[PDB]
């Protein structure tokens, strides 16, 4: 590929799974580096961006969080990562980052 | 790389001679069509009537 | 009378730079010379940032 | 290659047509011999180990004798013309990933449940045209299909320019955009490929596919970005490999079946066809009926494979010989 | 409704023993070839007729 | 690139009767000629409806 | 059908259930293929997208879930699927995917 | 992060404080003191007055 996507990946994984895998054995663990893990995060994010129907809540996601500081009484901590996807019909997509990559 | 290669097991052999294994496959088939011909043996073009 | 879009698609109505407006979000260009008025509503289609208000002449 | 038989089949190569049983000097030479009463027919072929005579054809027990050209055996390679559906947009969308999915059946295994998918991706930009998009799609497709690490030659990607809609230009994993200068590209052709062939081991097979497109968001709606129109085939797969596998099989009936089973202790058969030549065929189907109680028909067929030279010479002469010898009226190619 | 089938066979297959030069195999209803250890070829036509 | 307004004021962007919208609601009007355009955006100023978009001239 | 719609389906199943089924008998199990289950999910999604008078929060749906990892502490997973619908007056179309299809 | 919706129930950018002037009196304020970037990278903040 010259450009990575979750559509590219999830189609590949699903077409392969519908052909070769039973619905209960479509957990695909992926090995890669940590630059790919960031790229997975960025792609999973924009897809979820287009999920306009749902409103994603910091209560459940805890994207922004409260930490104890002295500069303020309500001090906040921001940051998240997408480390996994779950496509339709039994497809789970997890990551296993090795430094070898 | 060492841990990578240790993720895999080893199989002890008894020679340095090439080895070959049997590969099983699938059975169910569909047969492709080459051509169709009219009752007169004439070929069936795509822009043709039933 | 009812709401025009789910709040998910309304939370993405933003105020910023035309060069950073991707899809799944609508742009509003506030007016300076006038306080409350608006200049244009914009939505990207094919890399270009087009308007949703139909031009009106005399 | 194993095939179906009507209880037997034989093959004899007509590498040269003689006129007598005294002119069978070189191997492959052959003559049709028939009574002047025209009650029987047979062929005297010159074997590498000498001379032979095919089984005798009782001309009143002849079912069908037809000649087949080589064009009718050359597998025509399926093409798929690919373009942008002007309904969604006649040009690319400047932020959408244009993914293409070529689904393959009859990959290594024999079945249709042997599926296999290769892709090609192009994220499009603002000033992009259709020509540039087709170019980049072809590069993405070649780098995944026309590479030098894939075990199989899946397809053959091409490009066509509206200036010359007849000339197709190839695209390999090595091709680079600098080699593709034309600014008028309108489609992407995707053919099949002649797969590896091995006499008696690997029959001439293929792997067909369907270009299945993925959706893009054009106006906030999921819509397909292209159409895969089949066009008239242009390339073919000559029959040399088919005739050689037929000879390899049909020379195990009047000969050795332990072709190599037990290697030093074998009988080496000397096959006579060149897998790099195009042959034109003649199949005579006939049977043998016995006497009073033995009325059942033992059906038989024998094939004659001569060489072609564009024109169907070397069989029209063979046909004329059989026709004057046996009185049969066989059609020329 | 009605159906019919048949299968013709020579007589030298009476006790034909196969020389397992490549593994002989059985088609299955699933669509998978399984390899078998049998050496008699009518064991392999019985399966396919059924 | 902050939201142009908060959600409690975006929630009140509605589609329907010009007579039934309060002072707290913004009115949208989907253009009927074109399929994805807007023709006007209105909110009540003094009991009357007025366009938020600035009027353009040549 | 050329374009599958859940609007047409809920109408047909209700009208049928009214004239022929008790409110306690209007469960409809559909046998289809994995690609049909996805078509069904897509349409149920396009449908609730029209429920503008409601707000679908991830707190109740868990569309985006929090999974533990080592790349991060606020690590997330994303993915959902619509399998059911419930039209008025007892209609509840449920799904069943068969490999035979 | 238009993808997300930052709610007061989690952030508490507007807290509730006891007071004399009302039964539901509110306290408003917040500050970002920390960031959590991908792959373990955490950014804290330790203000020093010498600066």
UniProtKB/Swiss-Prot annotation, chain D:
Any one of the GO CC terms: viral capsid, decoration
This protein's UniProt keywords: Capsid decoration protein, Capsid protein, Virion
Cystines in this chain: none
Predominant localisation class: virion
Localization in the cell: Virion
The UniProt record lists the keyword Acyltransferase: no
Region (FD): 75-237
Note on domains (UniProt): The central region FD is structurally similar to Helicobacter pylori flagellar cap protein FliD.
Quaternary assembly: Interacts (via FD region) with the major capsid protein.
Role this protein plays: Auxiliary capsid protein that forms an outer layer on the major capsid protein protrusions.
Protein name: Auxiliary capsid protein
Organism: Bacteroides phage crAss001
UniProtKB/Swiss-Prot annotation, chain E:
Subunit architecture: Interacts with the auxiliary capsid protein (via FD region). Interacts with the head fiber dimeric protein. Interacts with the head fiber trimeric protein. Interacts with the portal vertex auxiliary protein.
Protein name, UniProt field: Major capsid protein
Function: Capsid protein self-assembles to form an icosahedral capsid, with a T=9 symmetry, about 77 nm in diameter. Each asymmetric capsid nonamer is covered by 9 capsid auxiliary protein, 1 copy of the trimeric head fiber protein and 2 copies of the dimeric head fiber protein.
Residues of the full protein shown: 203 to 252 of 504
Misc. remarks from the entry: Displays an HK-97-like fold with an insertion domain that protrudes at the capsid surface.
Localization terms from the record: Virion
Organism: Bacteroides phage crAss001
Lineage start: Viruses, Duplodnaviria, Heunggongvirae, Uroviricota, Caudoviricetes
């Amino acid at each position: 590929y010259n450009t990575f996507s979750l559509k590219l990946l999830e189609d590949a994984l699903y077409e392969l799974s519908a052909s070769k895998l039973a619905m209960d054995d479509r957990l695909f663990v992926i090995k890669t580096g940590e630059r790919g893990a960031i790229q997975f995060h960025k792609e999973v994010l924009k897809t979820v961006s287009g999920w306009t129907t749902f409103v994603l809540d910091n209560n459940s996601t805890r994207v922004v969080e409260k930490v104890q500081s002295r500069l303020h009484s309500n001090a906040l901590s921001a940051g998240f990562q997408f480390v996994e996807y779950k496509a339709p019909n039994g497809v789970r997509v997890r990551l296993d980052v090795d430094p070898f990559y | 790389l060492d841990t990578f290669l240790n993720s895999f097991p080893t199989r002890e052999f008894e020679d340095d001679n090439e080895y070959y294994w049997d590969v099983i496959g699938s059975s169910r088939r569909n047969i492709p069509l080459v051509e169709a011909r009219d009752e007169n043996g004439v070929v069936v073009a795509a822009n043709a009537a039933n | 009378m009812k709401r025009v879009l789910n709040l998910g698609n309304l939370s993405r109505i933003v105020e910023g730079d035309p060069n950073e407006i991707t899809d799944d979000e609508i742009l509003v260009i506030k007016d300076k010379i006038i306080e409350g008025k608006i200049i244009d509503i914009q939505k990207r289609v094919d890399g270009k940032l087009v308007s949703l208000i139909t031009e009106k002449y005399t | 290659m194993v095939i179906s038989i009507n209880q037997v089949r034989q093959l004899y190569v007509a590498k040269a047509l003689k006129a007598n049983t005294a002119a069978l000097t070189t191997a492959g030479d052959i003559v049709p011999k028939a009574d002047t009463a025209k009650t029987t027919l047979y062929f005297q072929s010159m074997s590498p180990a000498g001379i032979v005579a095919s089984d005798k054809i009782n001309l009143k027990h002849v079912l069908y004798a037809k000649a087949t050209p080589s064009e009718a055996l050359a597998h025509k390679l399926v093409r798929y013309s690919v373009t942008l559906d002007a309904d969604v947009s006649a040009t690319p969308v400047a932020g959408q990933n244009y993914i293409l999915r070529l689904a393959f059946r009859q990959y290594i295994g024999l079945s249709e449940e042997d599926q296999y998918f290769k892709y090609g991706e192009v994220i499009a930009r603002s000033g992009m045209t259709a020509s540039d998009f087709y170019k980049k799609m072809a590069i993405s497709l070649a780098k995944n299909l026309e590479n030098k690490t894939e075990s199989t030659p899946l397809v053959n990607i091409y490009l066509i320019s509206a200036a010359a809609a007849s000339t197709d230009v190839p695209v390999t994993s090595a091709t680079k955009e600098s080699d593709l200068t034309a600014t008028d590209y309108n489609q992407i052709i995707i053919e099949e490929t002649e797969q590896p062939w091995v006499l008696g081991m690997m029959p001439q097979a293929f792997i067909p596919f369907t270009p299945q497109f993925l959706t893009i968001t054009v106006d906030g709606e999921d819509r397909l970005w292209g159409v895969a129109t089949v066009v008239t085939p242009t390339k073919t797969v000559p029959d040399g490999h088919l005739i050689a596998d037929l000879e390899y099989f049909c020379m195990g009936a009047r000969g050795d079946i332990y072709r190599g089973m037990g290697y030093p202790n074998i009988i080496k058969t000397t096959y006579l066809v060149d897998p790099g030549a195009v042959y034109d065929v003649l199949d005579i189907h006939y049977f043998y009926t016995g006497s009073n109680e033995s009325v059942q028909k033992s059906e038989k067929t024998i094939t004659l494979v001569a060489v072609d030279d564009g024109s169907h010479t070397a069989m029209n002469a063979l046909i004329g010989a059989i026709n004057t010898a046996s009185g049969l009226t066989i059609a020329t190619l | 409704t009605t159906i019919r089938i048949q299968h013709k066979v020579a007589g030298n297959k009476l006790n034909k023993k196969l020389a397992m030069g490549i593994p002989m195999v059985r088609n299955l209803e699933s669509g998978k070839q399984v390899k078998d250890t049998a050496n008699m070829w009518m064991h392999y036509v019985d399966w396919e007729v059924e």
